[PDB]
C-alpha cells in the first residue's frame, strides 16, 4: 500500500503536524515527494518527519 | 496550497482530518484521487478529495 521506511534515529515531534518516532520503528510513508520532510503514518496518526531520518525498506 | 470545504466531514479515525463546510484546508497531497492529505488547526489527516475545492 505505502512504502515503509526504517527509522534510523529518534525523532521528537514538537508540533501536532509532526510524526515523532523512536529509532527502529517502521513508518508508512504516505508522501515521499518533498525532499526534506515526508508524511508518515505511525501509531494511527499522520505527521511530517525528516526524510533523512529513515531508510526505505526494500523487503 | 489551499482548498475550500464544500461539505462538513466528520473524522472517525485518528488519521482523518475533520472540517466544517466553508473552512479552508491546506492540501499537502492531492496525488490520490479519493483521499487527500490536509492540514487544519495544525494537525494532518486524510479526507475525501471530493469534499473540497482547491484554491490555493
Amino acid at each position: 500500500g505505502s512504502p515503509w521506511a526504517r527509522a534510523l534515529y529518534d525523532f521528537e515531534a514538537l508540533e501536532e503536524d509532526e510524526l515523532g518516532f523512536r529509532s527502529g520503528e517502521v513508518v508508512e510513508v504516505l508522501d515521499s515527494s518533498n525532499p526534506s520532510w515526508w508524511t508518515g503514518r505511525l501509531h494511527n496518526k499522520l505527521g511530517l518527519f525528516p526524510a533523512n531520518y529513515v531508510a526505505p525498506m526494500m523487503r | 496550497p489551499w482548498a475550500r470545504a464544500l461539505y462538513d466531514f466528520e473524522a472517525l479515525e485518528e488519521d482523518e482530518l475533520g472540517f466544517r463546510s466553508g473552512e479552508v484546508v491546506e492540501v499537502l497531497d492531492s496525488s490520490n484521487p479519493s483521499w487527500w492529505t490536509g492540514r487544519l488547526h495544525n494537525k494532518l489527516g486524510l479526507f475525501p478529495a471530493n469534499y473540497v475545492a482547491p484554491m490555493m
Binding site: 505505502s2 504516505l30 | 488519521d15 490520490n32 479519493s34 483521499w35 486524510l46 475525501p48 471530493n50
Partner: peptide
Amino acid sequence: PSIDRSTKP
C-alpha cells in the same frame, strides 16, 4: 457521495 474508506491510503 458515499464516503468509501476502502480507498484510503
